[PDB]
Amino acid sequence: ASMRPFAQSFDIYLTQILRVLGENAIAVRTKAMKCLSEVVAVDPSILARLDMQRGVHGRLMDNSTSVREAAVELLGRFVLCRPQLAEQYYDMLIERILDTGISVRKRVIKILRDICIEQPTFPKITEMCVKMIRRVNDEEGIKKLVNET
DNA sequence: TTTTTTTTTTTTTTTTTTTTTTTTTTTTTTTTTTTTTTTTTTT
């Protein structure tokens, strides 16, 4: 089988999915992001190819809250999985608290809570606590989440 | 009869897409007015 022209298809598949990410329908881009996130969380040493990098950055800055929360969910699961090597994505993550949705804020707060529980002695604990306390008055559901956390 | 994990069902939250609905002039109609037009009365 490893001689046959099927085992060397996975590469192709990624490329195909990444052609999709620039398109003009929201649901399709959301699903592309979720499927890519699942792929990434299976084989965590795939956030290396430069095209995937530029893809997830672009979609992190995208103009619709659905794909934004999808992208931040990918990045958060990747950070939680690999304990170290996250000091490079923390800045682009913690930029996203101020993101004018209610999805993205809740997702970033959940990811931050799991960080602050799982691997203490991380350097940026104080700033994380300051920002989460800062958002205590922002909304209602978010308020409940921060209060119980 | 009453407790527990696993599974099953409900329900709850939050976005995106469609849907009735309010408004915003524009035009039409109809009744009110009033000015002119028409019609006897009288000094």
Curated annotation (Swiss-Prot):
State the tissue distribution: Widely expressed. Highly expressed in heart, skeletal muscle, fetal and adult liver, fetal and adult kidney. Expressed at intermediates level in thymus, placenta, peripheral leukocyte and small intestine. Weakly or not expressed in brain, colon, spleen and lung.
Q: Give the location in the cell.
A: Nucleus; Chromosome
Q: Where does the source fall among the domains of life?
A: Eukaryota
Q: Where are the HEAT repeats?
A: 7-45, 83-121
Q: What does this protein do?
A: Plays an important role in the loading of the cohesin complex on to DNA. Forms a heterodimeric complex (also known as cohesin loading complex) with MAU2/SCC4 which mediates the loading of the cohesin complex onto chromatin. Plays a role in cohesin loading at sites of DNA damage. Its recruitment to double-strand breaks (DSBs) sites occurs in a CBX3-, RNF8- and RNF168-dependent manner whereas its recruitment to UV irradiation-induced DNA damage sites occurs in a ATM-, ATR-, RNF8- and RNF168-dependent manner.
Domain remark text: Contains one Pro-Xaa-Val-Xaa-Leu (PxVxL) motif, which is required for interaction with chromoshadow domains. This motif requires additional residues -7, -6, +4 and +5 of the central Val which contact the chromoshadow domain.
Task: Give the linked disease.
Answer: Cornelia de Lange syndrome 1: A form of Cornelia de Lange syndrome, a clinically heterogeneous developmental disorder associated with malformations affecting multiple systems. Characterized by facial dysmorphisms, abnormal hands and feet, growth delay, cognitive retardation, hirsutism, gastroesophageal dysfunction and cardiac, ophthalmologic and genitourinary anomalies.
Record note on quaternary structure: Heterodimerizes with MAU2/SCC4 to form the cohesin loading complex. The NIPBL-MAU2 heterodimer interacts with the cohesin complex composed of SMC1A/B and SMC3 heterodimer, RAD21 and STAG1/SA1. NIPBL directly contacts all members of the complex, RAD21, SMC1A/B, SMC3 and STAG1. Interacts directly (via PxVxL motif) with CBX5. Interacts with ZNF609 (via N-terminus). Interacts with the multiprotein complex Integrator. Interacts (via PxVxL motif) with CBX3. Interacts with BRD4.
What is stated as this protein's family in its record? Belongs to the SCC2/Nipped-B family.
- Protein name stated in the entry: Nipped-B-like protein
Q: Could you tell me which species this protein originates from?
A: Homo sapiens (Human)
User: Which gene is the coding source of this polypeptide chain?
Assistant: NIPBL
